Design goal:
Order of helices and strands: EEEHEEHHEEEEEHEHHHHH
Oligomer: monomer
Shape: globular
CATH class of the largest domain: Mainly Alpha
Largest sheet: 5 strands, antiparallel
Name: Tyrosine-protein kinase JAK2
Entry title: Discovery of VX-509 (Decernotinib): A Potent and Selective Janus kinase (JAK) 3 Inhibitor for the Treatment of Autoimmune Disease
Distance between the termini: 46 Å
Strand order of the largest sheet: 1-2-3-5-4
Number of strands: 11
Assembly: monomeric
Radius of gyration: 19 Å
PDB class: transferase/transferase inhibitor
Bound molecules: ligand VJK
CATH topology of the largest domain: Transferase(Phosphotransferase), domain 1
Keywords: jak2, kinase, Transferase-Transferase Inhibitor complex
Number of helices: 9
Length: 286
């Protein structure tokens, strides 16, 4: 069924990014304010290149049906398309964890970790590369469920290759990037696994500001480094085994999972199927 533009009542801005904006809207055809609250994504500056990428993101989201992937609801046509998605009122895992801090125990962080792995494994079966796995891009449905949000940077692997090469990169979350992504702009399941190790780190630091991957990496390379020199030094640091520290109070076993994800050798990084099995075993033991 279709969504009429005239019936989408603006409520609040949710955020802005990669040439798009996300708003919380009430889909109210009855005009009595009893309509469903939905998340609406639209392009801000809609060029023919941006429309093309937006359409691809719509096709990607529509093709995904998993408990740990934000639900596609529809499209609203007025091109200047609007992507309609389910609204998750608890917001991002980043904001949720920052607010609720250590009142969320290790058992609970591992329940979220497992769900992220499962969502990522399912994504990999479709030959999709997320490229922006971070706690800011994970949504909380409720206390017991998290989902991967924002597919704006997702690439589909070529039929004959196991990596996607970005020729002209835009805004990049470099402190979540695998070394081959920094040096050769190569993205794969293995680079998504590297970013997952960074997600696990974020979780176990409970989003403490001084402990964030940009703060830790900047201290390691020197806060005097600027622009492209940050990328140059981060590459050399990663090459010489500089890694994010073990978060305070993080179990040894969870830090080992992070370090395995952060392997310079792309083939030696674990698989998401293995990670979900491993994390479920840790959970069971606890
Ligand atoms: C896309 C919206 C945006 C900019 N920021 C947020 C921030 C807080 N809360 C919501 C939100 C709540 N409920 C929703 N339901 C669906 C989509 C988004 C939301 N979004 C983003 O890219 N960051 C997270 C991602 F997980 F969505 F990817």
């Amino acid at each position: 069924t279709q969504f009429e533009e005239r019936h989408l009542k603006f409520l609040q801005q949710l955020g802005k990014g990669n040439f798009g904006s996300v708003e919380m809207c009430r889909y109210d055809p009855l005009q009595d304010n009893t309509g469903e609250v939905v998340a609406v994504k639209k392009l801000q500056h809609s060029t023919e290149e941006h429309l093309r990428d937006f359409e691809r993101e719509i096709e990607i989201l529509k093709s995904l049906q998993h408990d740990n992937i934000v639900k596609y609801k529809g499209v609203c046509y007025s091109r200047n398309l609007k992507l309609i998605m389910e609204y998750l009122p608890y917001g991002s895992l980043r904001d949720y964890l920052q607010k609720h801090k250590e009142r969320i125990d290790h058992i609970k962080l591992l329940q979220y970790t497992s769900q992220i792995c499962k969502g990522m494994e399912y994504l990999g079966t479709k030959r999709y590369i997320h490229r922006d796995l971070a706690t800011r891009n994970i949504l909380v449905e409720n206390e017991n469920r998290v989902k991967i949000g924002d597919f704006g940077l997702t690439k589909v692997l070529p039929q004959d290759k196991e990596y996607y090469k970005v020729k002209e990169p835009g805004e990049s979350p470099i402190f979540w990037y695998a070394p081959e992504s920094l040096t050769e702009s190569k993205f794969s399941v293995a680079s998504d696994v590297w970013s997952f190790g960074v997600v696990l780190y974020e979780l176990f630091t409970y989003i403490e500001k001084s402990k964030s991957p940009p703060a830790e990496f900047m201290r390691m390379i020197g806060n005097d480094k600027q622009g492209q020199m940050i990328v140059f030094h981060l590459i050399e640091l990663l090459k010489n085994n500089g890694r994010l520290p073990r978060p305070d109070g993080c179990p040894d076993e969870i830090y080992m999972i992070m370090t395995e994800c952060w392997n310079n050798n792309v083939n030696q990084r674990p698989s998401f199927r293995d990670l979900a099995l491993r994390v479920d075993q840790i959970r069971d033991n606890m």
